[PDB]
Amino acid sequence: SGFRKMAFPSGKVEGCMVQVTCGTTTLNGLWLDDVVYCPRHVICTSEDMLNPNYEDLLIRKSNHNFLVQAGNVQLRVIGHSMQNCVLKLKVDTANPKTPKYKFVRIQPGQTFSVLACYNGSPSGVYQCAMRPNFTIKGSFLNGSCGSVGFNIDYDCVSFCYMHHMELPTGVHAGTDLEGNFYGPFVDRQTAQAAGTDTTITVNVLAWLYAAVINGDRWFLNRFTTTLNDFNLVAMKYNYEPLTQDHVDILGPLSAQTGIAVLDMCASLKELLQNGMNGRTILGSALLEDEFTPFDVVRQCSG
Amino acid sequence: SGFRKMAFPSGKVEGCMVQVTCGTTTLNGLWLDDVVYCPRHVICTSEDMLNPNYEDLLIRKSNHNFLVQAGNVQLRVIGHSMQNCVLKLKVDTANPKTPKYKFVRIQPGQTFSVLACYNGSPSGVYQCAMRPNFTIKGSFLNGSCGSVGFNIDYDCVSFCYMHHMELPTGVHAGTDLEGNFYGPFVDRQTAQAAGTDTTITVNVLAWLYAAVINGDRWFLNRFTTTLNDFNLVAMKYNYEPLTQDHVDILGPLSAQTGIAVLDMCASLKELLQNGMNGRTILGSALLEDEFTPFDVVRQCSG
Ligand SMILES: CN(C)CCNC(=O)C[C@H](Cc1ccc(F)cc1)NC(=O)[C@@H](Cc1ccc(Cl)cc1Cl)NC(=O)[C@H](N)Cc1ccccc1C#N
Ligand SMILES: CN(C)CCNC(=O)C[C@H](Cc1ccc(F)cc1)NC(=O)[C@@H](Cc1ccc(Cl)cc1Cl)NC(=O)[C@H](N)Cc1ccccc1C#N
Numbered sequence: 001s002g003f004r005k006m007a008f009p010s011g012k013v014e015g016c017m018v019q020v021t022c023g024t025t026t027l028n029g030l031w032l033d034d035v036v037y038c039p040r041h042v043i044c045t046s047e048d049m050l051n052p053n054y055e056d057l058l059i060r061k062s063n064h065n066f067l068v069q070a071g072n073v074q075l076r077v078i079g080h081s082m083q084n085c086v087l088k089l090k091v092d093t094a095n096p097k098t099p100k101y102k103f104v105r106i107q108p109g110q111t112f113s114v115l116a117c118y119n120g121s122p123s124g125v126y127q128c129a130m131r132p133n134f135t136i137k138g139s140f141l142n143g144s145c146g147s148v149g150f151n152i153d154y155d156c157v158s159f160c161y162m163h164h165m166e167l168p169t170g171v172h173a174g175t176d177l178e179g180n181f182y183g184p185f186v187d188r189q190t191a192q193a194a195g196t197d198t199t200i201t202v203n204v205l206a207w208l209y210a211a212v213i214n215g216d217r218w219f220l221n222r223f224t225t226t227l228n229d230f231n232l233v234a235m236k237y238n239y240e241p242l243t244q245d246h247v248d249i250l251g252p253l254s255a256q257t258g259i260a261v262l263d264m265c266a267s268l269k270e271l272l273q274n275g276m277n278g279r280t281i282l283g284s285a286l287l288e289d290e291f292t293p294f295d296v297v298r299q300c301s302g
Numbered sequence: 303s304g305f306r307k308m309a310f311p312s313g314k315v316e317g318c319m320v321q322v323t324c325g326t327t328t329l330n331g332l333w334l335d336d337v338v339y340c341p342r343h344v345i346c347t348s349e350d351m352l353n354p355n356y357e358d359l360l361i362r363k364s365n366h367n368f369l370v371q372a373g374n375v376q377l378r379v380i381g382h383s384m385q386n387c388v389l390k391l392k393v394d395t396a397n398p399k400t401p402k403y404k405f406v407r408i409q410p411g412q413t414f415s416v417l418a419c420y421n422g423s424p425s426g427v428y429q430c431a432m433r434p435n436f437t438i439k440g441s442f443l444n445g446s447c448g449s450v451g452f453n454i455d456y457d458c459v460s461f462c463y464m465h466h467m468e469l470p471t472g473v474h475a476g477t478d479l480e481g482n483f484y485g486p487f488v489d490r491q492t493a494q495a496a497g498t499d500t501t502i503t504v505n506v507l508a509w510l511y512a513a514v515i516n517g518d519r520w521f522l523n524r525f526t527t528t529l530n531d532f533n534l535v536a537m538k539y540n541y542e543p544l545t546q547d548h549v550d551i552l553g554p555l556s557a558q559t560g561i562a563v564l565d566m567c568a569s570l571k572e573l574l575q576n577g578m579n580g581r582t583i584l585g586s587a588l589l590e591d592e593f594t595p596f597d598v599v600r601q602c603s604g
């Protein structure tokens with residue numbers, strides 16, 4: 001028992017992290033087969049970053065402008081090309097530790113693990129949720145660009161995020177591994193802002209179920225509510241509306257605990273209206289929304 | 303920027319996890335050089351677990367009673383021996399992925415990463431603190447015994463914890479890699495209890511400093527306090543007393559922010575007496591005490 005924010009084991013991804021240097025800029029790349037993926041702004045200088053035209057900047061580059069280091073061993077670039085906001089560097093060696101992998105794009109509300117890296121060297125691992133405004137609340141210092149986010153499914157790594165930038169408010173923005181940004185952001189050094197955020201309602205319920213499975217029951221009640229009467233309370237507290245599809249995903253957790261989804265909605269209605277009265281749920285005094293139904297199942301009986 | 307609970311990259315440890323089977327019991331072992339380490343209760347049956355004598359039980363065993371599996375590849379046991387509460391199995395192969403490592407015992411209040419494993423296969427990574435009562439609040443299901451906790455220092459893995467058991471209250475107890483329990487627990491299936499817990503004061507202050515470094519300042523004040531006048535407030539709220547040695551460890555964080563330790567103590571005095579008034583610090587509505595000064599430095603400028 002116990003419920004903690006858990007990351008995927010990072011070893012399969014650690015063997016893919018390299019350091020890409022161009023000019024005086026150095027960041028991280030992802031080495032799969034004979035291709036290194038990294039943020040395209042690595043080709044920018046300090047002055048180009050204000051209003052770059054990346055088509056221009058790449059055309060003015062050649063293979064010898066990019067220094068690739070897999071540990072102490074320098075790799076040889078034999079080709080380059082741009083794929084939206086990521087640069088692809090072809091090298092003369094297939095990474096012999098290349099795992100089975102996929103490039104997948106995730107949905108707001110879904111989670112992944114981040115392997116934070118500096119100069120091609122992994123320094124830490126943690127879990128993130130894609131917020132409804134397509135930012136993540138991560139932990140990234142200068143030089144962490146190119147760090148990747150990923151899920152793991154039976155020794156297949158699904159890469160879903162590459163880190164590009166920090167916004168003025170301290171939240172983080174990146175692309176999928178095809179170079180397409182999450183959200184309405186561009187890789188240009190101008191102050192952009194995220195849209196307004198909301199709480200992921202289905203994740204909160206999943207977390208309440210996790211709490212019940214772990215012996216926290218103080219917030220339950222005998223009452224029930226209708227799907228429509230709950231969505232009214234959601235809008236008043238800036239929660240996402242609950243769908244009939246969300247209830248079916250919560251089936252396995254409802255099944256295991258005996259608590260119907262709409263009975264747990266009634267408990268959540270009361271926590272929103274009353275607060276917690278000094279008590280905690282799984283060690284938090286706030287309602288947590290960064291656990292998916294899948295994260296709950298995977299940790300509570302998986 | 304951003305501050306998250308971060309684990310060490312787990313790859314160096316993933317290549318050391320094996321599955322040890324004896325009788326109908328199967329759990330995880332740690333394979334370093336030609337030795338596999340695992341919890342000794344793997345030699346117990348269901349009836350021996352009530353009041354075992356482990357000297358007796360091991361003497362009645364032989365090398366062919368232990369099945370070791372490093373993936374699909376079965377390893378051959380050529381010797382066995384007991385080291386307090388851990389069993390050591392000698393095998394005919396030195397693990398070729400053995401990292402540079404040390405066996406270290408940690409202190410209450412220090413943190414480490416846990417690689418949770420099931421049947422020799424890593425399933426997740428998270429951070430833990432050793433509580434002052436020598437338990438940890440982890441996430442462990444049946445079969446996770448033998449999972450290890452570890453820190454990393456310049457590609458040297460310091461192993462500090464092996465998981466053995468869950469207590470009635472849901473907290474977890476284990477040994478160091480020399481087989482000596484943390485705290486007053488034994489590896490016998492009887493209901494034991496931990497001593498009473500306390501908040502790690504030096505970790506809370508470290509976390510307040512992390513919050514300042516990340517732009518959270520709402521809890522600061524102009525007031526200051528004396529070391530002795532603060533220790534009085536600590537005892538009233540079940541916090542550990544603050545030493546002169548603790549203040550010097552907080553030097554680097556005090557230096558970086560301009561806020562003296564005893565000025566931050568005055569801020570903590572007020573949060574304890576008043577609470578948070580509905581506000582949060584680094585995404586929490588509670589005072590967090592599972593970050594060391596080292597974890598803060600390592601993430602906020604390291
Ligand atoms: C102090 N604290 C409370 C919060 C303060 N918050 C900030 O200081 C972040 C800061 C906010 C900002 C200010 C003005 C702008 F006009 C745009 C953004 N943002 C930047 O410095 C960006 C600039 C950038 C550069 C390149 C592109 Cl394509 C796109 C961009 Cl917007 N730099 C990165 O993001 C680097 N790549 C990696 C990096 C560098 C420094 C710090 C963090 C990170 C990360 N991760
Ligand atoms: C439901 N929820 C709200 C909280 C309920 N809490 C409990 O159910 C844990 C439960 C609490 C307990 C009850 C009676 C006792 F008398 C001693 C302990 N404890 C055990 O089942 C222990 C027993 C054990 C076995 C061997 C030794 Cl050496 C030492 C020990 Cl005390 N089993 C393990 O710890 C296994 N090794 C691994 C394991 C099995 C099942 C569940 C978790 C874990 C873990 N991790």
Ligand code: NA
Nearest residue numbers: 005007126127
């Ligand atoms: Na984590």
